[PDB]
Amino acid sequence: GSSGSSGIKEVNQALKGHAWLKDDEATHCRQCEKEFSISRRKHHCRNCGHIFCNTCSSNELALPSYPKPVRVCDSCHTLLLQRCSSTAS
Ligand SMILES: [Zn+2]
Ligand SMILES: [Zn+2]
Hints:
This is RUN and FYVE domain-containing protein 1. It is found in: Early endosome membrane. It is a single chain. By secondary structure, this protein is mostly beta strands. The chain contains 1 helix and 4 strands, in the order ββββα. β1 and β2 (about 50-55) form a beta hairpin. The N and C termini lie far apart (about 70 Å). The site of one zinc ion (ZN) has 8 residues, from α1.
């Protein structure tokens, strides 16, 4: 014979988005998402060329553009570290 069973547990979902936000002059970091402060200055990457904080700029790497390793962002450091550059230029 056949013995079926109906009855599923579902939940309503409808999250609303409403929060004053604006990033024109790099109000906050583009990674950690933290409020910039006097002590926490900003750092303009040399590769990606973006705005980041000290926490997101505590790494250096020797790029093919510059002779010596400059201060880069974790987004570039880790990336370049987990990438494959076989004479790409
Ligand atoms: Zn940051
Ligand atoms: Zn970068």
